[PDB]
């Protein structure tokens, strides 16, 4: 019964999301069952890639607790300059000798996940896997597969549940698709204010 | 209810928390209603202070969407130095300027309030249009400096809680409920000679 004037439709609802997550969670706890996870010494370190995945991470770990999987929360922040490769915040502690699970919001071209994967993989972790809230499969620019996928979606601009558009709509409880209407009406006013060529460097 | 061997008693349950947040979300919406929050141009900037607030922040903004309050999520990360001033090291700053915007700092708990007062002052200097703070938990007696939040989800006694984002030795942040760590563990873990 939720509606968003700015959305063209609705891909998943809060509850639908909760279910798939609870599902993959269980599937994650089962794969690590024989790895000997332990609080304090051998936790499953979750590298939460800010900022798209903040919501998915909140719920994801809680679900993982329901299946008694000790985890350690790590938060890194990446950005774009393609692919979000500019590192703005790295992990708080070492990941060496630990089992790590990179938590990404949505893998599209995979340029980011691919980059983050090899990056941390070279930091000798006990093992490295990946989990993404959404997979766009048909958008890859490099070959990359996420160990765990919450849902596969068709190429479209999604927002909500942590996902965003110009830092907007992250707070939605549901995963909806931005109306191309707003995309245009919005960037046209953004790419405008941006071009405020204030470069008043009048040297001469 | 859930059983927690390492926990001594539960202070609040997910559902108990889900409720108090709605009421606080509600209040916030009532307060900022006369300002004119509008997406993109003038939203309620939430400065989520990693990492104790990762989970609180997540629910809070969803509850705020319910009362249809436009928000902008900013994630900042601080670190200690090794200071009776509260000074901390900035590891991650807001991506956008908070000047001329209404800001709401989202902290997980406020014991000594040293870090929070420092963060408050700092951002205060950046000329925001207004600046308030919302805390999941509060220990009014353990203040090492004068400070009062603007929205306290729940007041608590000077105990040592964990869960719902809060930690102990970088552990237990994933708990769904806020619980009190039993001494036996706090001591058995303090075998810091290795
Ligand atoms: O439809 C979308 N909506 C919002 N963000 C997106 C969307 N597609 C990709 N992203 C973001 O782009 C980042 C990098 O994607 P990739 O490098 O193409 O794998 C992801 O972590 C997301 O934050
Ligand atoms: O009872 C507690 N359990 C876990 N962490 C706590 C507790 N009390 C305070 N903290 C942490 O100590 C930090 C500093 O407190 P503040 O300066 O009063 O905000 C908080 O941001 C929390 O991360």
Return the CATH number at B24.
3.40.50.2020
User: Which pairs with CB-CB distance under 8 Å and at least 24 residues apart come from B172-175?
Assistant: B172/A39, B172/B6, B173/A61, B173/A72, B173/A73, B173/B51, B173/B52, B173/B54, B173/B55, B174/A61, B174/A62, B174/A64, B174/A65, B174/A71, B174/A73, B174/B55, B175/A62, B175/A65, B175/B4
Question: How long is chain B?
Answer: 194
> Beta partners for A148?
A131
The resolution, in Å, is: 2.7
Question: How long is chain A?
Answer: 204
Nearest residue to B153 (alpha-carbon basis) of B19, B20, B18? B20
Phi-psi region of A160 (alpha: psi -120 to 50; beta: other; left: phi over 0): left
Contact state of A61 with B174 under an 8 Å Cβ cutoff: yes
Q: How far apart are CA A161 and CA A170, in angstroms?
A: 6
Nearest CA to ligand 1 atom 3: A158
| Cα-only R_g, chain B | 17
Report cis status (omega within 30 of 0) of the bond before A51: yes
| Per-window interface: B 57-96 vs A, CB < 8 A | 57-59, 61-62, 64-66, 70-73, 75, 77, 91-92, 95-96
Which range of residues forms the domain containing residue B19? 1-194
Distances (CA, A) of A178 to A6, A115, A157, A172, B64: 6, 27, 6, 12, 20
Contact, A132 vs A151, CB < 8 A?
Answer: no
Please give the distance of CA A48 from its chain centroid, rounded to a whole number.
7
Phi-psi region of B153 (alpha: psi -120 to 50; beta: other; left: phi over 0): alpha
Does B103 sit in the ligand 2 pocket, CB within 6 Å? no
Q: How far apart are CA A170 and CA A52, in angstroms?
A: 8
**Which residues from chain B sit within 8 angstroms of residue A166, using beta carbons?**
40
* Gapped junctions in chain A, after residues (C–N > 2.5 Å): 81
Nearest residue to B6 (alpha-carbon basis) of B157, B176, B184? B184
Q: How far apart are CA B11 and CA B9, in angstroms?
A: 7
Any idea what the Cα angle at residue A99 is, between residues A29 and A108, rounded to 5°?
80
Q: How far apart are CA A11 and CA B155, in angstroms?
A: 39
Contact, B27 vs B68, CB < 8 A?
Answer: no
Q: How far apart are CA A107 and CA A143, in angstroms?
A: 11
Q: Count up the domains in chain B and report the number.
A: 1
């Amino acid at each position: 019964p939720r509606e968003y004037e700015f959305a063209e439709k609705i891909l998943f609802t809060e509850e639908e999301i909760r279910t798939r997550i609870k599902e993959v969670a269980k599937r994650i706890a089962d794969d690590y069952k024989g790895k000997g996870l332990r609080p304090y010494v051998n936790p499953l370190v979750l590298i939460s890639v800010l900022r798209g995945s903040f919501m998915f991470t909140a719920d994801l770990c809680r679900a993982l607790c329901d299946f008694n999987v000790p985890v350690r929360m790590e938060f890194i922040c990446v950005s774009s300059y393609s692919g979000q490769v500019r590192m703005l915040l790295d992990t708080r502690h070492s990941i060496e000798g630990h089992h790590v699970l990179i938590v990404e919001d949505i893998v599209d071209t995979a340029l980011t996940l691919n980059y983050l994967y090899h990056m941390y993989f070279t930091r000798r972790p006990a093992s490295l896997k990946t989990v993404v809230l959404l997979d766009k499969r048909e958008g890859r620019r490099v070959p990359f597969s996420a160990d765990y996928v919450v849902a596969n979606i068709p190429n479209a601009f999604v927002i909500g549940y942590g996902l965003d558009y110009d830092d907007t709509y992250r707070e939605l409880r549901d995963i909806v698709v931005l109306r191309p209407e707003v995309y245009a009406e919005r960037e046209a006013a953004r790419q405008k204010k941006q071009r405020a060529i204030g470069s008043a460097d009048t040297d001469r």
